[PDB]
Amino acid sequence: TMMERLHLFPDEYIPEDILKNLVEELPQPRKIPKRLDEYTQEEIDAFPRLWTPPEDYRL
Amino acid sequence: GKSGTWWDEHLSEENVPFIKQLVSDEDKAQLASKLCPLKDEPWPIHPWEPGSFRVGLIALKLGMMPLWTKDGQKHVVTLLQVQDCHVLKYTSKENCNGKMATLSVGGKTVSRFRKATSILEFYRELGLPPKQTVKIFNITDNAAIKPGTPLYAAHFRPGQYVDVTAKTIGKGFQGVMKRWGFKGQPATHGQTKTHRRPGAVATGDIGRVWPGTKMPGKMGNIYRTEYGLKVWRINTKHNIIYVNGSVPGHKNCLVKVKDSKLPAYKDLGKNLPFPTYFPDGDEEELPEDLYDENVCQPGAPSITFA
Amino acid sequence: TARGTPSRFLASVLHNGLGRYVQQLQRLSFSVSRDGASSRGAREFVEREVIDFARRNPGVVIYVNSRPCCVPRVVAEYLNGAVREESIHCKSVEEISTLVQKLADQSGLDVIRIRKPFHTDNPSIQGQWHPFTNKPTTFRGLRPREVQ
Amino acid sequence: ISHGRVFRRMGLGPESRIHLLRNLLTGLVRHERIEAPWARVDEMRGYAEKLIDYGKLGDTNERAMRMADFWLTEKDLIPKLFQVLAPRYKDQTGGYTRMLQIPNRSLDRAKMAVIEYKGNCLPPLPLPRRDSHLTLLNQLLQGLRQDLRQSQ
Amino acid sequence: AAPKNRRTIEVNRCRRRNPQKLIKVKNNIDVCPECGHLKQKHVLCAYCYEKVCKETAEIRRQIGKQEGGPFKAPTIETVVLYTGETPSEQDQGKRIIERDRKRPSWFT
RNA sequence: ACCUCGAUGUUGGAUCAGGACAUCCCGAUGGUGCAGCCGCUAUUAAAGGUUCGUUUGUUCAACGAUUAAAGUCCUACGUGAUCUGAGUUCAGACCGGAGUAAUCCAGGUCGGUUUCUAUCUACUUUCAAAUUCCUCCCUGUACGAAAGGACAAGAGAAAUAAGGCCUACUUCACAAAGCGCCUUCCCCCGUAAAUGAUAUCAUCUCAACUUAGUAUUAUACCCACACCCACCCAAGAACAGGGUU
RNA sequence: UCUCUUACUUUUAACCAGUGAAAUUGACCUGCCCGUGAAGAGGCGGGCAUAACACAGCAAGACGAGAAGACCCUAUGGAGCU
RNA sequence: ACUGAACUCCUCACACCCAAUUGGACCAAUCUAUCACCCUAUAGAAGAACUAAUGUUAGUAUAAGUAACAUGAAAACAUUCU
RNA sequence: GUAAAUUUAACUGUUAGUCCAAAGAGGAACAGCUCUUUGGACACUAGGAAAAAACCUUGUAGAGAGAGUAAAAAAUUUAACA
RNA sequence: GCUACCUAAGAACAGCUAAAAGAGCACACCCGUCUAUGUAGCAAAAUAGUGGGAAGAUUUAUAGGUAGAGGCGACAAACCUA
Ligand SMILES: [Mg+2]
Ligand SMILES: [Mg+2]
Ligand SMILES: [Mg+2]
Ligand SMILES: [Mg+2]
Ligand SMILES: [Mg+2]
Ligand SMILES: [Mg+2]
Ligand SMILES: [Mg+2]
Ligand SMILES: [Mg+2]
Ligand SMILES: [Mg+2]
Ligand SMILES: [Mg+2]
Ligand SMILES: [Mg+2]
Ligand SMILES: [Mg+2]
Ligand SMILES: [Mg+2]
Ligand SMILES: [Mg+2]
Ligand SMILES: [Mg+2]
Ligand SMILES: [Mg+2]
Ligand SMILES: [Mg+2]
Ligand SMILES: [Mg+2]
Ligand SMILES: [Mg+2]
Ligand SMILES: [Mg+2]
Ligand SMILES: [Mg+2]
Ligand SMILES: [Mg+2]
Ligand SMILES: [Mg+2]
Ligand SMILES: [Mg+2]
Ligand SMILES: [Mg+2]
Ligand SMILES: [Mg+2]
Ligand SMILES: [Mg+2]
Ligand SMILES: [Mg+2]
Ligand SMILES: [Mg+2]
Ligand SMILES: [Mg+2]
Ligand SMILES: [Mg+2]
Ligand SMILES: [Mg+2]
Ligand SMILES: [Mg+2]
Ligand SMILES: [Mg+2]
Ligand SMILES: [Zn+2]
């Protein structure tokens, strides 16, 4: 019975009746570790440079 | 409490033949009304694409016959007669499983007095006699035909491989010897009432019998399919298909015929009619008998090797 | 065993303690024997302590029949129609006095399993909990994943 | 498996079955009406048809004479078969040995049938009559038939 | 093989009181149009069949009385007659058996 | 000597086999004292298969003829309410030996009753996606010094297994069968290689990554809610099912 | 006999009617896998499974039924024989 | 930090959780003496208490409506037939 | 610090024991093996270690819809080279 | 009154080959080799088939005799009322 009261969907699509039934979305437990490209360059400028590299290096 | 009843229970001595005659005439008129599918309002006819599948048909198993090839080899063939085959209903791609479209096709005509009332209403709306069997064919959307169209044997052409599904001959409750080919036990060397028994059924450690164990039981009355049967000949006058080898089930049984799904014959329908065979717009009637190019025709020069 | 016996909830008869307390015991009827070794405790109870009991509580009517019996008895009748019969057969006077005082102390309600030894008629003062208590509202009452 | 297997196993063997059917057929020829268990009556009806055909084959036919001599065990019904029964069905081709179901045998509750040669100076059996043409449904169908005839 | 345990009355009631073991109700039963004695469809009425059988037995007894002994089987047709009922012109060569009765109003 | 002596029946064999891989064959790789054909050894792989006989009760063993091979093991040394009873091991008897004798021998031999009507659990078509050998060509080529002698690709023939069928043949005969005929479709992973850092070379990568590399997001079956006395049936123990225009 | 089994008949069988036993039975609302445990679990632990209820089969388990093991040992228990 | 016993505390009460064995307080039925007189008391006594002995007898189940067991055919019930 | 001990009188029952820690002996520095000694537990309650005799926590009896606790949950991941 | 042996007085043994016969084939009759069924069975030892004998050391009816520390035994520890 508890599993009959459970509804799973693999994507963003949800049926309209269930959506009209929805209340009080729960918050996500994990924190989405925020990959490099979405970092609001102000934050990059805030973060310090830990080491000065040699000028004669190729990487 | 309402007693049961049949169609001719309260009918009179004079009214019984009248009812039979009238119902048979209405049946024949309905059957003849569908003779020209291309003039009523045909659904659009699409060209054949590589990854496309067309409809099959329902046939009747007539019997088996010998046949000989130009090299002198003998093959036994089975005759499948198309009695009254029509497309009954068509479901859209998304209305069944979203995987493939479906076409329902009906078999030989039966009596209207011994069918379910819902089935009777369905066939009344369709405007056709009731069919003994209905089989569903998975098709691509470009092969759909209008419901009520007739299907003819020339839908299949010689030099083609088909699949034949039917209910095999039922042998009732059979012992393990006949059912599973089990060897029995010796006949005279001392055995005590143990000549056809299955013997052991499991081991002692397991303490039970596995689900897949072979034991005596009802045998034979199940649907089975024969794959890759080559058609050798089409008789257009009587709508007969000559299919290589044997076909499951008894004679006078209804079989489901459709193109073989074996990988060796995936796209061989470039030369097969692809809404269906339509004998109205052909503008040239087919011969009474279409043969395969390797078949010794009945009128032959009595082939001599060289 | 509780599963093999009836049950009830804790209750009063007519809201006894709300206004005035009233004695729920109505009558005590005693069957005691003139002769007979089993009615000796009852005999001396009637001799000494029945008069003082009647004077102590005058809301109870006490009858003493004094008939030949093998088993002397006391029948307690309560304002709610309940009837209870007890045997005072071969009991001491102190035993009988304790019995009659206990009978006067109890109410007529059945002595069965009591089921949650408290009876409040107003269990909630700040409002009973429902799944929307302790739940904040949204602007325009918009449920999750809405548009307008 | 008994696919397409006529001739039920009746007695203690094929000869016993043949002799039981022969006794039933002799009784039928003698009495013109015989009651017996249903399946035996079915087999004996199948046999009585061909007995009447052999009788119609002619008195002087040697093969018919031998067949009658075997199948009639009283030797005084063979003249009956050849001069009463066969000449009774000269016009008709195969329509005799009317067979009906009678309620049940009392002791063992067996399914019971009655079988009679037509003609049969015996009193008639309570045959099941069809519904009269004056009933409401039959009158409606008759009106439909008349309307169809007029529309033709 | 012996039962390891006694079967309980609950199990026995479930086995022997389920619908497969119960008697089915039959709807083949209607009134006989003649004699109104509750026949069954597809089966002859017991009352009418008994009447016919009694008349046939009387006729056969008369046949045996007239025939003499065994092995007779006359080579002519037969006709049953009743009180009065002079023989008809078509039944000349037929054997005549007239026992004594008023012809029943079902045998014509 | 821990359960069982108010009974847990034993060796071999028959029948049916479930499972492990520590693989006998079929698949894929590394090394080789691997030129080729045969081999040896190691990694991975348990879907499939793993013969018939003479002697002996044999499991083993020897031998004969084959095969791609004739695997090891567990399953109450699987399985006697399915079977057998040839040994073992009761009562009869003989021989060799022991004993005064009765009697005895982890000596041999002739003979010697195998019960059970199934209450419970379990189970009784999982509807399907086969494997192997051989022949021909390649080729008498790759390879040697000679004998010898391959792969891969292709074509064709079978055998077995599974599933059906009766037109021939055969047992038979309004049927059922085999000795007859018809059909049978995807991989699997261990390594072999690009670019490239940690460690500006190089490095197949429990580095990020690119290939051989994934058959599957498989397709075939089957999927009609209530005419039903009764009759027939290629349907069937009963029930159910198909037909009755 | 077997490779290698098949067909039919009778009995049996299954259904209908009549009559009507016996062994057996602690109670049972009586599942599978792994583990545990008087050391081989339907009933215990962890999982999995799971509307109810007849009929026909089968014999893997219920250390299945029957016979207070006959084999072995013990008893200051017997008896036959020398 | 929390959970977690029949350990300990808390309100009230306390003789009220070991086999064999041993000590003790009561006690059902019955009969007898004397009471009592809708079923009791004080004493004396004894064939004095049964969820178990493959216990004895009787009843009734389970297996089970199961295994099993019957009557050659037609008819006029004279008779005839296989 | 504690409250038991000896003697006298009258008797039964127990005298076919297991595992754990420790010192040993035999065996294989095998055994859920056999034999001694010291102690514990079990053959009595409850909680824990998965179910669990013998390991750990815990004991003296009742009711409570109060409380504090006891024992009580396993952590580990690894080879370049001048 | 079964059975072992005996006593008295009886009975039976077709047909064929007859070598002459405790000879051969073979009925009745006596027995019980092997197989299958049965195993609470028809039966507390049977049925079907197949077998050994069947003019003799044969089979068999009747009455009588020998009895348990015994009888009887062409010794199987056989039989002496399952
Ligand atoms: Mg065989
Ligand atoms: Mg046997
Ligand atoms: Mg047999
Ligand atoms: Mg020990
Ligand atoms: Mg034992
Ligand atoms: Mg036991
Ligand atoms: Mg491996
Ligand atoms: Mg074994
Ligand atoms: Mg077994
Ligand atoms: Mg022998
Ligand atoms: Mg057996
Ligand atoms: Mg069970
Ligand atoms: Mg060469
Ligand atoms: Mg060269
Ligand atoms: Mg019955
Ligand atoms: Mg286990
Ligand atoms: Mg069953
Ligand atoms: Mg059990
Ligand atoms: Mg047992
Ligand atoms: Mg014993
Ligand atoms: Mg002793
Ligand atoms: Mg707590
Ligand atoms: Mg006594
Ligand atoms: Mg007593
Ligand atoms: Mg009792
Ligand atoms: Mg008892
Ligand atoms: Mg049963
Ligand atoms: Mg039976
Ligand atoms: Mg020990
Ligand atoms: Mg305490
Ligand atoms: Mg002689
Ligand atoms: Mg002789
Ligand atoms: Mg001797
Ligand atoms: Mg001896
Ligand atoms: Zn009537």
Swiss-Prot record, chain A:
It comes from the Eukaryota. It is found in: Mitochondrion. Belongs to the universal ribosomal protein uL13 family. Component of the mitochondrial large ribosomal subunit (mt-LSU). Mature mammalian 55S mitochondrial ribosomes consist of a small (28S) and a large (39S) subunit. The 28S small subunit contains a 12S ribosomal RNA (12S mt-rRNA) and 30 different proteins. The 39S large subunit contains a 16S rRNA (16S mt-rRNA), a copy of mitochondrial valine transfer RNA (mt-tRNA(Val)), which plays an integral structural role, and 52 different proteins. Interacts with OXA1L. This is Large ribosomal subunit protein uL13m. The lineage of its organism: Eukaryota, Metazoa, Chordata, Craniata, Vertebrata.
Swiss-Prot record, chain B:
GO terms for cellular component: mitochondrial inner membrane; mitochondrial large ribosomal subunit; mitochondrion. It is found in: Mitochondrion. GO terms for molecular function: RNA binding; structural constituent of ribosome. InterPro entries: Ribosomal_uL3, Ribosomal_uL3_bac/org-type, Ribosomal_uL3_CS, Transl_B-barrel_sf. It comes from the Eukaryota. Signal peptide: none annotated. Keywords: Disease variant, Mitochondrion, Primary mitochondrial disease, Ribonucleoprotein, Ribosomal protein, Transit peptide. GO terms for biological process: mitochondrial translation; translation. Pfam families: Ribosomal_L3. Belongs to the universal ribosomal protein uL3 family. It is linked to Combined oxidative phosphorylation deficiency 9: A mitochondrial disease characterized by failure to thrive, poor feeding, hypertrophic cardiomyopathy, hepatomegaly, and psychomotor retardation. Death in infancy has been observed in some cases. Component of the mitochondrial large ribosomal subunit (mt-LSU). Mature mammalian 55S mitochondrial ribosomes consist of a small (28S) and a large (39S) subunit. The 28S small subunit contains a 12S ribosomal RNA (12S mt-rRNA) and 30 different proteins. The 39S large subunit contains a 16S rRNA (16S mt-rRNA), a copy of mitochondrial valine transfer RNA (mt-tRNA(Val)), which plays an integral structural role, and 52 different proteins. This is Large ribosomal subunit protein uL3m. It comes from Homo sapiens (Human).
From Swiss-Prot, chain C:
One of its GO terms (cellular component) is mitochondrion. It comes from the Eukaryota. Coiled coil: none annotated. GO terms for molecular function: RNA binding; structural constituent of ribosome. Keywords: Mitochondrion, Ribonucleoprotein, Ribosomal protein, Transit peptide. It is found in: Mitochondrion. The keyword Transmembrane helix does not apply. High relative levels in skeletal muscle and testis. Lower levels of expression in the heart, brain, placenta, lung, liver, kidney, pancreas, spleen, thymus, prostate, ovary, small intestine, colon and leukocytes. Expression is coregulated with TWNK. One of its GO terms (biological process) is mitochondrial translation. Component of the mitochondrial large ribosomal subunit (mt-LSU). Mature mammalian 55S mitochondrial ribosomes consist of a small (28S) and a large (39S) subunit. The 28S small subunit contains a 12S ribosomal RNA (12S mt-rRNA) and 30 different proteins. The 39S large subunit contains a 16S rRNA (16S mt-rRNA), a copy of mitochondrial valine transfer RNA (mt-tRNA(Val)), which plays an integral structural role, and 52 different proteins. Belongs to the mitochondrion-specific ribosomal protein mL43 family. This is Large ribosomal subunit protein mL43. The lineage of its organism: Eukaryota, Metazoa, Chordata, Craniata, Vertebrata.
Swiss-Prot record, chain D:
Keywords: Mitochondrion, Ribonucleoprotein, Ribosomal protein, Transit peptide. It is found in: Mitochondrion. One of its GO terms (biological process) is mitochondrial translation. GO terms for cellular component: mitochondrial inner membrane; mitochondrial large ribosomal subunit; mitochondrion. GO terms for molecular function: protein domain specific binding; structural constituent of ribosome. Gene3D superfamilies: Ribosomal protein L17. The keyword Glycoprotein does not apply. The keyword Ribonucleoprotein applies. It holds the Pfam family Ribosomal_L17. NCBIfam families: L17 (TIGR00059). Belongs to the bacterial ribosomal protein bL17 family. This is Large ribosomal subunit protein bL17m. It comes from Homo sapiens (Human). The gene is MRPL17.
